[PDB]
Motif scaffolding. Sequence first.
Motif, short mmCIF file in Angstrom:
data_model
loop_
_atom_site.label_atom_id
_atom_site.label_comp_id
_atom_site.label_asym_id
_atom_site.label_seq_id
_atom_site.Cartn_x
_atom_site.Cartn_y
_atom_site.Cartn_z
N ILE A 46 0.88 -1.19 0.00
CA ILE A 46 0.00 0.00 0.00
C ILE A 46 0.90 1.22 0.00
N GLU A 47 0.71 2.10 -0.96
CA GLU A 47 1.37 3.41 -1.01
C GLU A 47 0.34 4.54 -0.85
N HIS A 48 0.84 5.67 -0.38
CA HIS A 48 0.07 6.95 -0.47
C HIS A 48 0.05 7.40 -1.94
N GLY A 60 5.66 3.45 0.63
CA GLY A 60 5.97 3.59 -0.78
C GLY A 60 7.20 2.74 -1.06
N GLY A 61 7.48 2.62 -2.36
CA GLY A 61 6.86 3.39 -3.43
C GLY A 61 7.50 4.75 -3.63
N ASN A 62 7.28 5.30 -4.81
CA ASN A 62 7.86 6.60 -5.18
C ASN A 62 7.56 7.70 -4.15
N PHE A 63 6.37 7.60 -3.52
CA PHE A 63 5.99 8.57 -2.49
C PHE A 63 7.04 8.72 -1.38
N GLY A 73 14.95 2.88 1.40
CA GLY A 73 14.53 3.68 0.30
C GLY A 73 13.65 2.97 -0.72
N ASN A 74 13.42 3.63 -1.85
CA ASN A 74 12.59 3.12 -2.96
C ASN A 74 13.13 3.52 -4.33
N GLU A 75 13.23 2.54 -5.24
CA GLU A 75 13.53 2.84 -6.69
C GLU A 75 14.58 3.93 -6.72
N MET A 76 15.77 3.75 -6.12
CA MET A 76 16.71 4.90 -6.10
C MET A 76 17.50 5.09 -7.43
N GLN A 105 8.97 -5.39 -11.12
CA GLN A 105 8.58 -5.54 -12.53
C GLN A 105 7.08 -5.53 -12.74
N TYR A 106 6.67 -4.72 -13.71
CA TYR A 106 5.29 -4.75 -14.25
C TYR A 106 5.36 -5.21 -15.69
N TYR A 107 4.30 -5.91 -16.11
CA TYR A 107 4.10 -6.36 -17.51
C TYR A 107 2.78 -5.88 -18.06
N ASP A 156 9.55 -7.09 -4.47
CA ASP A 156 8.58 -6.28 -3.66
C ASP A 156 7.84 -5.26 -4.51
N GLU A 157 7.87 -5.38 -5.85
CA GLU A 157 6.79 -4.83 -6.69
C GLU A 157 6.61 -5.79 -7.87
N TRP A 158 5.50 -6.48 -7.98
CA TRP A 158 5.15 -7.26 -9.19
C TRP A 158 3.65 -7.15 -9.45
N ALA A 165 1.80 -5.46 -6.21
CA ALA A 165 1.85 -4.01 -6.13
C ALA A 165 0.74 -3.46 -7.00
N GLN A 166 -0.41 -3.03 -6.45
CA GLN A 166 -0.68 -2.81 -5.03
C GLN A 166 -2.02 -3.51 -4.64
N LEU A 167 -2.38 -3.36 -3.36
CA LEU A 167 -3.47 -4.19 -2.80
C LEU A 167 -4.87 -3.64 -3.07
#
Length: 499
Positions: free
Chosen positions: A26-28, A70-73, A171-174, A243-245, A291-293, A348-350
């Motif tokens: 869950i991200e903001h 997050g996530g980018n947030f 951190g996230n996606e640095m 990864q997203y597809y 931790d993101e699919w 990613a995400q619920l």
Amino acid sequence: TKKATMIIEKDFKIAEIDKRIYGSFIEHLGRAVYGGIYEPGHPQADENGFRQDVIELVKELQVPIIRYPGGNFVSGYNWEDGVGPKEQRPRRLDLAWKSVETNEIGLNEFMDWAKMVGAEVNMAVNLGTRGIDAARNLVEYCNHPSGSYYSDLRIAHGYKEPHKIKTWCLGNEMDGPWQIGHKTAVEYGRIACEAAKVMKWVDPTIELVVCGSSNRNMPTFAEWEATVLDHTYDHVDYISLHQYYGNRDNDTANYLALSLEMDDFIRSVVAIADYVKAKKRSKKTIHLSFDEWNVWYHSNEADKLIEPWTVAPPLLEDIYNFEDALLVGCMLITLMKHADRVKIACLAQLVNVIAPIMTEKNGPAWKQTIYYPFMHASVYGRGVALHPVISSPKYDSKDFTDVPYLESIAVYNEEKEEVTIFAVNRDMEDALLLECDVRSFEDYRVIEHIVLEHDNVKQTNSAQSSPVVPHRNGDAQLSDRKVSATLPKLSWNVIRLGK
Ligand SMILES: *[C@H]1[C@H]([NH3+])[C@@H](CO)[C@H](O)[C@H]1O
């Protein structure tokens, strides 16, 4: 029809499945929090404003762990802005999603929600705009019992007992140019090292996830992981993958093959971890957090119409179809077949955002097509992943060669005396006649054969109507120590054995 065989041998094991491979996120972002888990005006809101209908839908998935916030947030977020009295919480510009964040929900209210759904929290720290001091203070606020400023501050805010968060993200996606406070692999590796040290000095019981690549196509892919692990190995426990597809070219046969890329990505990052282990002469093995699919692509054009600086915009709201559920099922089987090295994974995400659960304001919550394979994997997929020997027919696509029609693995639960076979048939035309050798499992029977199938790969679910739902009319039969099962064209299958 086509024929496929699979050996199910009790003594040829991959590993115990870590239940945390059935995690989520869950991200903001958009309506994940506001309008998703939390909607004080809703008729089904609890005493704390949390939607009871969403709580039930999450509990049925049996999600053990949820990454937050997050996530980018996170890379622009100040954790103190979301704790303490609401009147002193500032309104902020979230630069990740071009939204105003009210901070009406912050970490202590998210911990209350997580408790209601039975999930632990995988907490992320900001290493974009912030650094080591913020990281140690957050861990102290959350985990130190009392008798210091920040632990007594959590008590003053209403949370006497520490949250005792076990697993943290550095951190996230640095690596991403899109990230607030992007860092090179050296800059990141260095601040992650020094943050990891002070976090573990506050609470040595924690585990740490260091940030890997944001997707396999990054220009820095593999180089990033190697540099970041060179700087962090002795202080961290996992490395992440994202990864997203999507099916942007309307090519179902090529789409369903994409789990082969996911398989390559996993094996590549494991190799890196073992490279750096050898370089350092370390006895410790680092594992993976995927931790993101998910599937993501439907919302791209709608997203472009959203004006900046609204509260809780309707962002990233993919409506999933049946083929999306088949790819999710291939991705889950890919995680299971890597249970030896993938110990955490997060769908990613619920809620609402790229999500298996959708909600309407003042209205219903409903299950997307992708909810069903995720539920099945989480509920039926606890135990030991067995090493399969598969003989499957194959096809070639735009981007892939020798794609098995069959994607399958078996999980053995010794405590329940159950064996579960997860299988996708990628074939667009033919039923696969599957024969499974179970000689090594004495006195078993078919409990049931669940099937998710629909004639129209583009069919979606909605609040009103769910045409894409599982049935229990699969024909799996166990005789002569062989399970024989028809896997219909384009299907997800869960064959449950016991006794
Ligand atoms: C990964 C995804 N691209 C975003 C939505 O889930 C998230 O903020 C990133 O860390």
